[PDB]
Structure 1
């Protein structure tokens, strides 16, 4: 299928209307970030030749 970017939302804009929240949600979301790799070393002579 041709992908849909998102669901339609025509915001009800006008020159004298404002939307003020009457409640709220405390949202907890995760972010995963890699920090380090495995520290590897090579004995170049031993690897190439044994």
Structure 2
């Protein structure tokens, strides 16, 4: 009840915080991935949706 601790010296500390801000931007060609070079698939793909 009658005792306290008071700091008699100081230390300056530098600490690193790393935060992600951005992610890789990607574009996907639907026709190329699903149907490759096949024209017939592309025509079928149009019907799908």
TM-score greater than 0.5 by the shorter chain: yes
Runs of at least 4 residues of structure 1 off by over 2 A? none
Alignment size in residue pairs: 36
Could you tell me which runs of 5 or more consecutive residues in structure 1 were left unpaired when the two chains were aligned: 1-14
Q: Comparing both chains, which one has the higher relative contact order based on Cα–Cα distances under 8 Å and sequence gaps of 6 or more? A: 2
Question: TM (normalized to structure 1)?
Answer: 0.68
Could you tell me which runs of 5 or more consecutive residues in structure 2 were left unpaired when the two chains were aligned: 37-49
Query: Which of the pair is proportionally richer in helix?
Result: 2
